Amino acid sequence: LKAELKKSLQDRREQEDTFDNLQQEIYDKETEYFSHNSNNNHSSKSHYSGNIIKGFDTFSKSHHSHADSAFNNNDRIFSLSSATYVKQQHGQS
Amino acid sequence: KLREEKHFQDFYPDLNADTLLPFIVSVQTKELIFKGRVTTEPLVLKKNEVEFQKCKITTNELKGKKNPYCVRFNESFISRYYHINKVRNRKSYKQQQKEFDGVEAPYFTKFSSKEAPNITISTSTKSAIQKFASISPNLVNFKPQYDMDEQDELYLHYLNKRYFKDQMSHEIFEILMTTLETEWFHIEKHIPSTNSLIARHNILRDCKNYELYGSDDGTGLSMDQACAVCLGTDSDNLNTIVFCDGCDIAVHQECYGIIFIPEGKWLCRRCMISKNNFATCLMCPSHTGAFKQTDTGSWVHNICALWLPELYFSNLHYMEPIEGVQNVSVSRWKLNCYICKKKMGACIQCFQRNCFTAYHVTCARRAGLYMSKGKCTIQELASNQFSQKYSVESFCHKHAPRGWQTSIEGINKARKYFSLLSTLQTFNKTIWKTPNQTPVAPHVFAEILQKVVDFFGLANPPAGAFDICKYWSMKRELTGGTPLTACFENNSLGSLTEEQVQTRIDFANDQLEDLYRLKELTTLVKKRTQASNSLSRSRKKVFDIVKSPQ
Amino acid sequence: RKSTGGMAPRKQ
Amino acid sequence: GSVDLEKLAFGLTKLNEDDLVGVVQMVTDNKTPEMNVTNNVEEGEFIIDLYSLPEGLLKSLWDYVKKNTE
Amino acid sequence: SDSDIRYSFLSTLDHLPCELIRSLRLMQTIDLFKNEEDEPGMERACRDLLLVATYINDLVDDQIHFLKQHKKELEIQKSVTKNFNSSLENIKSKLTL
Amino acid sequence: PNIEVSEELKVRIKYDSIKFFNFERLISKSSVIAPLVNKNITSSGPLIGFQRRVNRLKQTWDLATENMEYPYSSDNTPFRDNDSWQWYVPYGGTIKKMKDFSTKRTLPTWEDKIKFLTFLENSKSATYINGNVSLCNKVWFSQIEYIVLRNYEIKPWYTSPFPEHINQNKMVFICEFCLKYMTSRYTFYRHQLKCLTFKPPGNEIYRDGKLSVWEIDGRENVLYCQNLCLLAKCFINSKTLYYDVEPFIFYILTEREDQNAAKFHFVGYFSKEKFNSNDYNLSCILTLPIYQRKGYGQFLMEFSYLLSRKESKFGTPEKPLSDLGLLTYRTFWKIKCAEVLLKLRDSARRRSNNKNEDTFQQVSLNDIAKLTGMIPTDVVFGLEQLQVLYRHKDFNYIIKIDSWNRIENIYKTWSSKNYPRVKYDKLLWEPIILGPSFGINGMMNEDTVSSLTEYMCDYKNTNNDRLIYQAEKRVLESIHDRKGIPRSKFS
Ligand SMILES: CC(=O)SCCNC(=O)CCNC(=O)[C@H](O)C(C)(C)COP(=O)(O)OP(=O)(O)OC[C@H]1O[C@@H](n2cnc3c(N)ncnc32)[C@H](O)[C@@H]1OP(=O)(O)O
Ligand SMILES: [Zn+2]
Ligand SMILES: [Zn+2]
Ligand SMILES: [Zn+2]
Ligand SMILES: [Zn+2]
Ligand SMILES: [Zn+2]
């Protein structure tokens, strides 16, 4: 019926709202994760930090690198595993 | 090579980029093993053989259905792990394929629970599993592996008659033996290999044995052990001297066949397939050195398969199975050695003509006889295509080349070693392993067995729980050294010192902290997937009803 | 790094 | 030899079913190239010729039949 | 003198990220080239995305279980070798150096 | 009737095989038969795997009873000593309590030793009639003469390096769901009672009807694979890989039939490598002899080529072929090329209907390769076995089709055999990526700078399509727009 159809619009809106909330949360979580290495490497001086997807310990205590502190948007694999993200990414750029 | 595995540039140019223009209005073995000339082999292109047959009576068809006893404690712990012998809860074939290949039946996965979650397990079952796992720390995630034998079927009867009064069953015997070997594995994993003291003790034992009885394996010749197939003492980044850990032989990577060095500990073929038990080389009496299997399982020396002219390897990178024993010369087997005078194996002969004094290869190396590979390489010497080529050269006692010092002392050394061997053929100190290096199970294992017999609720006397602990160390000796259970773990802590273990813990901490953030991201991803699935499913239906109200 | 196949060539 | 084969053959006929299957199992276990026995498991038929059995096996069959018949 | 410690944990530092990225790439391929007018074409795609999501979950928790057990056995072996060294120093006077 | 005596001392005995093969009656009667045989009976005949073990045990325990004629030269310790430090640090120091590591009550002595040997000796007849009798110096020769896999008895072809005690016995039993081998039917019964899961390890990367393909890795299952190799060598003559099984990856074909458990029966397998520079795509392939020309080998070969195509490469099997490999695997080439020729014809017919044959389209071996998955040096053999390539007397080579009827007849005749074919849309796969260790846990001889964060952006270049049909249609349409050669050349 008319009301039976109408009652689905707000449900669609809420589902898209949850979808966007989860997308934003994954975005923020990986944004803080790919940097928590640098949070753990900067702050018994701790110079043994990194990721599991790029981190390593060949360096010594005398150096201080920032290539892990500055990361590009071509590393968020948990985001790139979606259709909407790559769609809007290629649409913007 | 035949005319299916060579190339197409043995055509005229036909570069395959040039364009071709299509239009419209029984057995061909073509060449020989290797370089030669064209030849047809339709007689060698043969496939058939005798047959294959189908058995008419199943294993479960031959079984005495009688059952004299039952258990009165934790029957569910048995019915879970073994096969509960009734008509259990089954499904119908008109539904099974629709349920496990249907519109919502996914593929399987190496992580999909080894149990069947569609059926339920009771809570008494889980409580019983917790009770059992609480017997000892090394009993977490337990499963009965051991398998029953035609001699254990006899031991069981004597145990039932003497101690347990027709209460012990096959399943409980298998469980007791499986627990015994699980505990022995966990005791063995942590034995520390050596330190400076034991290293000095072993090197001095080796040198003082060589000084009197001579050696062949490279031990005792110097402070740094040499190779065991070519007596080499140099190394480099392309092939290194890789030591073993059961025995203490050394080898070159390309002289033995080590295509890649594992990151943990290296175990040779004899200490990997069987155990270090003093095996039987087919061709010489002494059994100490680098061994390799044949095409059937026996164990022949690498120094022997090379020098015997009828023996070769079938793969020159792995040095895999020694081949060509079934066509050794009857005269070769009828010869008899002259330094140890033993009547076993096959020998080689002197080189200089008008001499027919024979000797085994290892007895020759022990005595000190002149042997030189020449300018050949190990790989050519192994390949057996050396026959049409030149030859390798040795000498007997009284045919030594100029400068080759006396070896009468050498033959005396060898005879003394074999004579002592033949004679030996016929702060509280506790002995804990048989002379053949097999184990003997201590008090704690009997205590664990008593606790398990309590768990299952049988009349348990300590004598009855020490009898099995005796019989274990003898069933593990009848078998040669191989563990009675098919299980084994690749872990080797062993030779690690203290600071190294400290650093390993420190790094494991970091990886452990990291995997948690990873797991958080993973579950976020899973939630997003579910959300988008539901969104699409609702959107399809709403757009359908909008595009068609009927 | 050297690749070695799980097979052996022809003998003769 | 010293085993009276006519008496052994007249005695083998005085056993029961499981004792006969015991005879079959005993012969099957130890068997030498000189002997000639035919065992058909596809339908269960055993055939053996006495005059080729060695002395140890003849003695053992004799002991079996003796201590299992009387 | 000492091999680089990074080469002892190759089930986690090396062999896990490869399977993780491979599974994520499979998810992306399914999600992108999934069709719209095909209702089964989207049912299969959602089913496979769910499959791969539970797969990556099970993988990343298996690895942490392994690391826990490895740390426990490291501790036990530390204790055992510290005991064995002193127990040998006890009866040092028996060897022949 | 039951027993009968002739006039020439030929005694007939009839019995029941069901009772005769029983596992309980066997031990019952063996216990009472074994002492009836004089223990001075000289077994001067051959050497059994059983008697060798028993006599080695006796010689090691130093017991005064011997029957074999082969005296071992070194079957005991070289220097038996009882003052070494090995008895002052019991169990390497892993147990700390004296009441717990004292072994005064668990050392076996002469009495229980002799009782154990008696237990061993009293089983001989049953051990034999279980391990060597079929339901239907001689040491260099293996005795194995059957392999009981499902319920069939599979005569082997060659000799595998099974352990010595398995090679001295002339029957081996193998559990398909686990690939474990034992030399006794009773032990087999016990093990098939214990073992519960009915599936290989590894994922399931394909499924259609019954057939399924499981992708067992190499270094995670170092026992399943090490037994599969030993089962393979008994049929595959030229192969020499048995233990270094980590750099390999196995793809296993299973047939399911349906406790109510899903039963997945082993049907065959093919292997592969993780990194090779010879441009191969397969190492060994096998189907268990219980088939009768059913199509699973051509299935698995098509599968290997699908994997190479979805990976976008070219490949060929490991080259030392066999006389049963090539005779089955040079028909695959002919049928593949016939299919591709029919495809080109039917795709050109839709536009060349209003035109004339005056123009001749130009096809190439690289453009047949990129459609098939195989290399040009194998497309040449396909076309040759099909008798379609002409080096007539610029135009040095052409492809002449005298009549499409012969080719469509070839294809229809091969299709009538109802073989199972691969469907490209049921595959849940993604080509594997390799880190700084190439899929092993071992040798160190690229640098740890891979970081693998790419392979995600590879959607950017829309040129290399992810689908297969896309590139197929691209090759079928784009490169075939060229103006055709005029037919004015020859007859
Ligand atoms: C790298 C390597 O190749 S080495 C390993 C190769 N060698 C082995 O594997 C030995 C054991 N396995 C085999 O022999 C198998 O046959 C394999 C691996 C070659 C694959 O063959 P299978 O799967 O068993 O049979 P498949 O169904 O695929 O072949 C059918 C076609 O093969 C051909 N053909 C196959 N076998 C025969 C044969 N014995 N005699 C005559 N023609 C045959 C026929 O064209 C047949 O078609 P048809 O039914 O119309 O007569
Ligand atoms: Zn060497
Ligand atoms: Zn070794
Ligand atoms: Zn030897
Ligand atoms: Zn000798
Ligand atoms: Zn199994």
**Contact call for F278 and C7, based on CB within 8 A:** no
Collapsed DSSP state (helix, strand, coil) of residue B371: strand
**Contact call for B539 and A29, based on CB within 8 A:** no
| Start-end of CATH 1.10.10.10 domains in chain F | 332-421+453-486
In a domain, A56, yes or no: no
Told to judge if F318 belongs to the known catalytic residues of this protein, a careful annotator would answer yes
In a domain, A52, yes or no: no
CB neighbours of residue B367 within 10 Å: 24
Residue type, F110: W
Q: Is B511 exposed, middle or buried (0-12, 13-18, 19+ CB in 10 A)?
A: buried
Contacts of F231 (CB under 8 A, 6+ apart): F147, F160, F174, F179
* Ligand 2 mean position, distance from CA B376 (Å): 13
**Whether CATH 1.10.10.10 fits F332-421+453-486:** yes
**Contact call for F453 and A86, based on CB within 8 A:** no
- Ligand 1 in reach of F321 Cβ (< 6 A): yes
Q: Which residue lies with its CA nearest to atom 30 of ligand 1? A: F293
Q: What's the angle, vertex CA F50, arms to CA F47 and CA F56, rounded to 5?
A: 80
The atom number, within ligand 1, closest to the CA of B47 reads 39
Helix axes B170-188, B152-159, angle to 10 degrees: 110
> In whole angstroms, how large is the CA radius of gyration of chain C?
9
Pick the catalytic residue from F176, F215, F302, F318: F318
Q: Can you tell me the distance from the alpha carbon of F398 to that of F383, in angstroms, rounded to the nearest whole number? A: 11
- Map F32-63 to HEC letters: HHHHHCCCCCCCCCCCCHHHHHHHHHHHHHCC
Q: Can you tell me the distance from the alpha carbon of F186 to that of F181, in angstroms, rounded to the nearest whole number? A: 13
Pairing mode, strands F147-148 and F172-175: parallel
Instruction: Point out residues after which chain C has a gap (C–N over 2.5 Å).
Output: none
Give ion ligand 3 contacts, CB < 5 A: B 244, 246-247, 268, 271
Q: How far is CA F293 from the centre of its chain?
A: 18
Q: Can you tell me the distance from the alpha carbon of F147 to that of F154, in angstroms, rounded to the nearest whole number? A: 5
Give ion ligand 4 contacts, CB < 5 A: B 281, 283-284, 301, 304
In a domain, A61, yes or no: no
Query: In whole angstroms, how far apart are CA F32 and each of D14, F29, F121, F131?
Result: 19, 5, 11, 20
Give the residue, out of F149, F248, F255, F287, with the most ligand 1 atoms within 8 A of its beta carbon, to mutate for a pocket test. Answer: F287
**Contact call for F76 and B278, based on CB within 8 A:** yes
Place of tokens 């007596």: B231
Q: Can you tell me the distance from the alpha carbon of F450 to that of F277, in angstroms, rounded to the nearest whole number? A: 20
| Structure-block tokens of residue F250 | 């196995």
Give the residue, out of F282, F293, F385, with the most ligand 1 atoms within 8 A of its beta carbon, to mutate for a pocket test. Answer: F293
Q: What's the angle, vertex CA E53, arms to CA B538 and CA A78, rounded to 5?
A: 95
F322 belongs to an annotated ligand binding site? yes
Collapsed DSSP state (helix, strand, coil) of residue F213: strand
- Ligand 1 in reach of F270 Cβ (< 6 A): no
E strands, B358-514, in order: 358-359, 371-372, 393-394
The atom number, within ligand 1, closest to the CA of F319 reads 1
Contacts of F436 (CB under 8 A, 6+ apart): E14, F446, F447, F448, F450
- Ligand 1 in reach of F331 Cβ (< 6 A): yes
Nearest C-alpha neighbor of A89 from the set A73, A78, A75 = A73
Q: Give me the count of residues in chain C.
A: 12
What are all long-range contacts of B502-509, with beta carbons under 8 Å and residues at least 24 apart?
B502/E78, B503/E5, B504/E5, B504/E8, B504/E74, B505/E71, B505/E74, B505/E75, B507/A57, B507/E5, B507/E9, B508/E9, B508/E67, B508/E70, B508/E71, B508/E74, B509/E71
Quick check: B251 and B245 in contact, CB under 8 A? no
| Start-end of CATH 3.40.630.30 domains in chain F | 134-323
Q: Is F77 exposed, middle or buried (0-12, 13-18, 19+ CB in 10 A)?
A: middle
B19 in F contact zone (CB under 8 Å): yes
Torsion angle of C-alpha atoms B209, B214, B216, B219, degrees rounded to 10: 30
End-to-end CA distance of chain D: 23
Q: Which residue, among B150, B157, B193, would best test binding to F if mutated, counting the most F CBs under 10 Å from its CB?
A: B150
Contacts of B203 (CB under 8 A, 6+ apart): B223
Write out chain A residues lying below 8 Å of F456, CB-based. 74, 77, 80-81
Quick check: E80 and F93 in contact, CB under 8 A? yes
Quick check: F256 and F242 in contact, CB under 8 A? no
What are all long-range contacts of E46-52, with beta carbons under 8 Å and residues at least 24 apart?
E46/B533, E46/B536, E46/B537, E47/B104, E47/B106, E48/B106, E48/F428, E49/B529, E49/B533, E50/B106, E50/B529, E50/B530, E50/B533, E51/B106, E51/B107, E51/B109, E51/F428, E52/E23, E52/E24, E52/E26, E52/E27
Q: Can you tell me the distance from the alpha carbon of A60 to that of A48, in angstroms, rounded to the nearest whole number? A: 9
Torsion sign across C-alpha atoms F89, F91, F97, F98: negative
Q: How far is CA B452 from the centre of its chain?
A: 31
Closest CB from A58, A77, A86 relative to E24: A77
Closest CB from F448, F456, F459 relative to A77: F456
Write out chain C residues lying below 8 Å of F238, CB-based. 7-10
Contacts of A1 (CB under 8 A, 6+ apart): none
Quick check: A68 and E14 in contact, CB under 8 A? no
In which element (H, E) is residue B158 found?
Answer: helix B152-159
| Structure-block tokens of residue F262 | 């899903």
F5 in D contact zone (CB under 8 Å): yes
F14 in D contact zone (CB under 8 Å): yes
Kindly report the backbone phi and psi dihedral angles of residue B499, in degrees, each rounded to the nearest multiple of 5, phi listed first: -65, -35
Overall number of domains in chain A: 1
E strands, F271-417, in order: 285-287, 359-360, 389-390, 398-399
- Ligand 1 in reach of F286 Cβ (< 6 A): yes
Collapsed DSSP state (helix, strand, coil) of residue F173: strand
F297 belongs to an annotated ligand binding site? yes
Ligand nearest B266 Cα, by number?
3
F172-175, strands of its sheet edge to edge = B53-54, F152-153, F147-148, F172-175, F180-182
Kindly report the backbone phi and psi dihedral angles of residue B300, in degrees, each rounded to the nearest multiple of 5, phi listed first: -115, 145
F295 belongs to an annotated ligand binding site? yes
Torsion angle of C-alpha atoms F214, F219, F220, F224, degrees rounded to 10: 60
Counting CB pairs under 8 A, whether chains D and C reach 3 or more, is no
Nearest C-alpha neighbor of F100 from the set B445, B549, A83, B547 = B445
Q: Can you tell me the distance from the alpha carbon of B3 to that of B496, in angstroms, rounded to the nearest whole number? A: 56
- Ligand 1 in reach of F287 Cβ (< 6 A): yes
**Contact call for B33 and C4, based on CB within 8 A:** no
Resolution reading in Å: 3.2
Quick check: B401 and B329 in contact, CB under 8 A? no
- Ligand 1 in reach of F326 Cβ (< 6 A): no
Output DSSP code: residue B60.
G
E strands, F68-227, in order: 147-148, 152-153, 172-175, 180-182, 207-208, 211-216
Quick check: B60 and B77 in contact, CB under 8 A? no
Domain that holds residue A6: 1-47+75-93
Kindly report the backbone phi and psi dihedral angles of residue A49, in degrees, each rounded to the nearest multiple of 5, phi listed first: -110, 160
B525 in E contact zone (CB under 8 Å): yes
Q: Which residue lies with its CA nearest to atom 35 of ligand 1? A: F328
Q: Is B15 left (phi over 0), alpha (psi -120 to 50) or beta?
A: alpha
Quick check: F306 and F424 in contact, CB under 8 A? yes
Q: Is F191 exposed, middle or buried (0-12, 13-18, 19+ CB in 10 A)?
A: buried
Instruction: Point out residues after which chain E has a gap (C–N over 2.5 Å).
Output: none
Kindly report the backbone phi and psi dihedral angles of residue F157, in degrees, each rounded to the nearest multiple of 5, phi listed first: -120, -45
Window A:7-66, CB contacts with B under 8 Å: 8-9, 11-12, 15-16, 18-19, 22-23, 25-26, 29-30, 33, 36, 48-49, 51-52, 55, 57
Contacts of F261 (CB under 8 A, 6+ apart): B116, F198
F41 in D contact zone (CB under 8 Å): yes
F286 belongs to an annotated ligand binding site? yes
What CATH architecture is F134-323?
3-Layer(aba) Sandwich (3.40)
What are all long-range contacts of F161-165, with beta carbons under 8 Å and residues at least 24 apart?
F161/B293, F161/B294, F161/B295, F161/B296, F161/B297, F161/B321, F161/F230, F161/F233, F161/F242, F162/B296, F162/B297, F162/F230, F163/B273, F163/B274, F163/B297, F164/B296, F164/B297, F164/B298, F164/F49, F165/F49, F165/F53
Contacts of D21 (CB under 8 A, 6+ apart): F15, F16, F19, F20, F25, F29
Collapsed DSSP state (helix, strand, coil) of residue F280: strand
How far A93 CA lies from chain B's nearest CA (Å)? Answer: 24
What are all long-range contacts of F220-224, with beta carbons under 8 Å and residues at least 24 apart?
F220/B110, F222/B490, F222/F246, F223/B486, F224/F178, F224/F179, F224/F200
In which element (H, E) is residue B291 found?
Answer: strand B291-293
Give the residue, out of F211, F238, F324, with the most ligand 1 atoms within 8 A of its beta carbon, to mutate for a pocket test. Answer: F324
Quick check: B96 and F260 in contact, CB under 8 A? yes
Q: Which residue, among F81, F94, F215, would best test binding to E if mutated, counting the most E CBs under 10 Å from its CB?
A: F94
F328 belongs to an annotated ligand binding site? no
End-to-end CA distance of chain B: 72
Q: Give me the count of residues in chain E.
A: 97
Counting CB pairs under 8 A, whether chains E and A reach 3 or more, is yes
Residues of F within an 8 Å Cβ radius of A: 448, 451-454, 456-457, 459
**Contact call for B530 and E50, based on CB within 8 A:** yes
Write out chain E residues lying below 8 Å of F456, CB-based. 21, 24-25, 28
Quick check: B40 and B27 in contact, CB under 8 A? no
How far C10 CA lies from chain B's nearest CA (Å)? Answer: 6
End-to-end CA distance of chain F: 86
Query: In whole angstroms, how far apart are CA F161 and each of B293, F29, F142?
Result: 7, 35, 10
| Structure-block tokens of residue B160 | 């039932």
Ligand nearest F191 Cα, by number?
6
Q: How far is CA E84 from the centre of its chain?
A: 31
- Ligand 1 in reach of F328 Cβ (< 6 A): yes
* Ligand 2 mean position, distance from CA B239 (Å): 10
Q: Which residue, among F8, F9, F19, F44, would best test binding to D if mutated, counting the most D CBs under 10 Å from its CB?
A: F9
Kindly report the backbone phi and psi dihedral angles of residue F213, in degrees, each rounded to the nearest multiple of 5, phi listed first: -125, 120
Q: Is F175 exposed, middle or buried (0-12, 13-18, 19+ CB in 10 A)?
A: middle
Q: Can you tell me the distance from the alpha carbon of B368 to that of B374, in angstroms, rounded to the nearest whole number? A: 17
Quick check: F229 and F242 in contact, CB under 8 A? yes
In which element (H, E) is residue B517 found?
Answer: helix B498-547
Q: Is E40 left (phi over 0), alpha (psi -120 to 50) or beta?
A: alpha
Write out chain B residues lying below 8 Å of F136, CB-based. 53, 55
Alpha helices in F122-243 (DSSP H): 124-131, 164-167, 185-194, 224-233
Strand-pair partners of F287: F268
Query: In whole angstroms, how far apart are CA B346 and each of B216, B331, B353, B392, B433?
Result: 18, 9, 20, 18, 35
